[PDB]
Amino acid sequence: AGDALRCGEDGWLQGSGAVTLQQGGQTLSPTLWFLQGYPLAQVNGGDRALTVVSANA
Amino acid sequence: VIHMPAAVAVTSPQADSAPAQRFSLPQGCHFRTFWRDEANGGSLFIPAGDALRCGEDGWLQGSGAVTLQQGGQTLSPTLWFLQGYPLAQVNGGDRALTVVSANAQRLILGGNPQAPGSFLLLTFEPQLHAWAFNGEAIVEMPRVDAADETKIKQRVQQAQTAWQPLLSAPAPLTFKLVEKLAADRVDPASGSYLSVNGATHLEGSEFKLV
Amino acid sequence: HMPAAVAVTSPQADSAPAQRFSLPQGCHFRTFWRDEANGGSLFIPAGDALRCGEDGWLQGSGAVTLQQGGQTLSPTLWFLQGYPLAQVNGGDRALTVVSANAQRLILGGNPQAPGSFLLLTFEPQLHAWAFNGEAIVEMPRVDAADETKIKQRVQQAQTAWQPLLSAPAPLTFKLVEKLAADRVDPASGSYLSVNGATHLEGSEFKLV
Amino acid sequence: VIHMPAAVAVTSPQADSAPAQRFSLPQGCHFRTFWRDEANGGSLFIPAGDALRCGEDGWLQGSGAVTLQQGGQTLSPTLWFLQGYPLAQVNGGDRALTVVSANAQRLILGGNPQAPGSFLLLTFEPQLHAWAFNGEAIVEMPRVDAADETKIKQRVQQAQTAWQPLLSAPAPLTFKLVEKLAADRVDPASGSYLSVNGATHLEGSEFKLV
Amino acid sequence: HMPAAVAVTSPQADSAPAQRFSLPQGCHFRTFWRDEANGGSLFIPAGDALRCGEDGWLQGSGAVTLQQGGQTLSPTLWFLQGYPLAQVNGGDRALTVVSANAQRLILGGNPQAPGSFLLLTFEPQLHAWAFNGEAIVEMPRVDAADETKIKQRVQQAQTAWQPLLSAPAPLTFKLVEKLAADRVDPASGSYLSVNGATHLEGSEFKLV
Question: Do D28 and C151 count as a contact with CB atoms less than 8 A apart?
Fold first, then answer.
């Protein structure tokens, strides 16, 4: 919880915050930037109108 | 012909005296328990809400769920706090109980006014970082009085009637009789001269295939 | 609604006849004994309730002694038409052996519930057929669309058969449109099962 | 620019049609479930009392504890009976629900009036001889309507608000969206075109040692 | 009541001095490097916030590059008196290095909570001391009979130290009557532990 991440009017979570992931004892805390709802790591475009050209698994 | 139960020597070794660690909460208070750091990679999560709440004694007070996570395993016992100690499978709400003794091995619960001279025995469960009730109980009673079968059945049903409500399930309460509680040793019932085991009633229909 | 039909898939039962075992007073008893070099013994005690009836078959209920490989068993066996049966005693009534081979025996002719049968499996260690809880009810799938008719027919078989029983098991019923009396499994084709309970009441002591 | 979720073919095989076995109780009624006799040596014990009781429909009715014992292991789920089926982790008391489908593999729960076109999915657990709810839910919804992000969030929060109370814990409800429920196949959500996962809120204090 | 005294059992700390590493602009930095044929590399980036101070020590906070065995680490290190420290940055205040050897470093001189210290363990892979959550509070056992005095002293150390921290761990405090500054374990003798929490709030997604 906090202001780093928040819901926008587009229906997607927005912002750039730490997200915690735990699996079998391990813990990762990457900073994720949400672009059109997709969580991205190691890149932050803030409010730039970047385009997701293609996203899959 | 009076048959007295034979005397049993107190043989158990001295209990460990190491203090419990403290766990400070946001609103100032402590609970206390033991947690031998064994690279277990464990977490204890006190939820926020009503069930638990700091008290004017300096201790976390109340009873509510508590989430323990270790090695991908998640347990969620309901813990009740007494003088800051977390206890599973006993809730002495409304009642003012004493912690006779507490260490990394066991906790002796006393102070029930409706059956003095009886004590619950709780065993430390590192998986919960808490003391848990598994049915074991202790009745202090002179061997001379246990010569009388009817005194036995009186004291032991006194204990049962006083401690039963505080317990989650009407459980098989097991009662060891002892001359003196040995609160200083690992087994406080060391020197127990007799054990009385209770039943749980069963009724209904059992299905089975072959 | 009608339960689905089920194809009889069990193969034809073995057809060997039981061997006869002749007792000195004239009668015979019939069971199977696969020669297994077990060197087993079958002892029928004399002077008890096991006696030669006028019909030529050993009759009555009593303990039979089986010794094989050092071990000794002595079930109580009731003989119906010369067949040793365990865990069932029909004395008062007059039941019939529908079918009997080295694998299983079917028990019918209970007049307080026709179209129902007990199944008993051959126990080679007892050289006898034993009842273990398995009953078959004959009833058309059309009838079994009515729940109340399933309850009626099951409760009729239960009452009619429970007095004669002593298996350490409750009765369970396989519903068939016809008994496959010539198969290994005579309930091959059963379109439904009803399992009954054993009632319990008492005190349990467990020490942890 | 309308983006429609792509269509997913219904591929799962036909569900098994084998009937459930019946289990008759003293007062006449049945419950039904599956129990592949695997020499498991298992027992099912319906206690006597109020929680369970035969009903005028010919089925065991109500919700209460049930003791399962197998290979020295003892489980005690609270089961709720619906049309004679035992179900764990869902109690639709006060509500009139439908069993869309039931077999040895899964049970589809329907009939919630406050969110039509949604179905719970329960999976058969042989350890309990019962169907259990683990969060999986199904929303029937035309792909064309799921082009609209706001219709998705409407139907899915309609489902959540209708089915939430019937559930034991406010659980992470997972919702698969499908054009038609495939009640005839092992996976009734075969051909689901989208999944929506809910969260569980967390708040309070976590302790941890190193 | 008074908590029981505890004997200092930890052995005397190793006494080797840290090696010096000379930078071209004059300054030195001091850490340990057990020759382990690791052929490790220590790269101090230039032109950043890592600079030679007038006192002769490398100063500031910035990323240091460690390459050993193909793998590369680049922690952010803050240099206090020439010592590389990880997960703690005291810049605003003026802290002192009570003790430093190849095994551990003690961090004192926090004026908003005297008699408290941070412990930092040597991490040979970083060639640097790292803070992991361990604080020591100096307080006499007599004082620790008062619960309110334990809370006071612990909450003073918490507030005074938490701004300077970035360990992925909450603070936990070992209460000693005196810091065993010359032992391997400087809390050898601690008569009580107080563990603090990390607060959580947010949404959890788990897929089963």
Answer: yes
A25 and chain B: CB distance < 8 Å anywhere? yes
Asked if the C-beta of B204 comes within 8 angstroms of chain A's C-beta atoms, the answer is no
Question: Do B24 and E195 lie within an 8 Å CB cutoff?
Answer: yes
Nearest Cα neighbor of D88 from D104, D71, D107 is D107
Query: How many CB atoms neighbour CB D57 within 10 A?
Result: 12
Is D189 in contact with D138 (CB distance < 8 Å)? yes
Chain B residues within an 8 Å CB radius of E195: 21-24
Contact B43 D203 (CB under 8 A): no
Give the method of determination.
X-ray
Contact indicator for C153, C110 with CB cutoff of 8 Å: no
- Residue C134, SS3 per DSSP: strand
What is the helix (H) or strand (E) element at residue C154, kind and residue range?
A: helix C147-161
| Cβ pair B71:A23 closer than 8 A | no
Does D153 reach chain A within 8 Å, measured CB to CB? Answer: yes
Tell me which chains share at least 3 CB pairs under 8 Å with chain B: A, C, D, E
Which residues of chain D are within 8 Å of residue C151 when distances are taken between CB atoms?
A: 24, 28, 30, 58
H/E run at residue C150: helix C147-161
3-state SS, one letter per residue, for chain D: CCCCCCCCCCCCCECCCCCCEEEECCCCCEEEECCCCCCCCEEEEEECCCCEEECCCCEEEEEEECEEEECCEEECCEEEEECCEEEECECCCCCCCEEEEECCCEEEEECCCCCCCEEEEEEEECCCCEEEEEEEEEEECCCCHHHCHHHHHHHHHHHHHHHCCCECCCCCCEEEEECCCCCCECCCCCCCCEEEECCEEEEEEEEECC
Q: In whole angstroms, what is the distance from residue D196 CA to residue C56 CA?
A: 78
Rg (CA), chain A: 12
Using the Cβ of E168 and the Cβ atoms of chain A, whether some distance falls under 8 Å is answered with: yes
Is B38 in the C-facing interface, judged by CB distances under 8 Å?
A: no
The torsion angles phi and psi of E67, rounded to 5 degrees, stand at: -120, 120
Backbone Cα Rg of chain D: 19
Strands across the sheet containing B200-208: C198-204, B200-208, D42-47, D67-70, D73-75
Task: Write the Ramachandran bin of D81: left for phi over 0, alpha for psi from -120 to 50, otherwise beta.
Answer: beta
Residues E182, D59: Cα–Cα separation, whole Å: 77
Report which secondary-structure segment, H or E, holds B161: helix B149-163
Instruction: Select from A1, A27, A29 the Cβ nearest to the Cβ of E201.
Output: A1
Name the closest residue on chain D to residue E201, using Cα atoms.
Answer: D203
Alpha-carbon distance of B184 to B186, in angstroms, equals 7
Residues 6+ apart with CB under 8 A from C164: C88, C89, C90, C92, C93, C95, C110
Which of the 8 DSSP states describes residue B163? Answer: H
By the 10 Å C-beta count (0-12 exposed, 13-18 middle, 19+ buried), A15 is classed as: middle
- Residue E174 CB-density burial (10 A; 0-12 exposed, 13-18 middle, 19+ buried): buried
Resolution in A: 2.5
C-alpha–C-alpha distance, residues C198 and C169, integer Å? 7
Say whether residue D30 is in contact with chain B using an 8 A CB cutoff. Answer: no
By the 8 A CB rule, do E131 and E87 touch? Answer: yes
CA distance D141 to B203: 48
**Which stretch of DSSP H or E encloses residue E156?**
helix E147-161
Beta-ladder partners of D44: B207, D68
First to last CA, chain E: 50
Q: By the 8 A CB rule, do E32 and E14 touch?
A: no
Name the pairing type of β-strands B30-33 and B67-70. Answer: unpaired
Q: Does C38 touch chain B (CB under 8 A)?
A: no
Closest listed residue to residue D202, CA positions, set B74, B39, B28:
B74
- Is residue A19 within 8 A of residue A9, CB to CB? The reply is no
- Residue A13: which H helix or E strand, with range? strand A13-18
CA distance B141 to chain A (A): 49
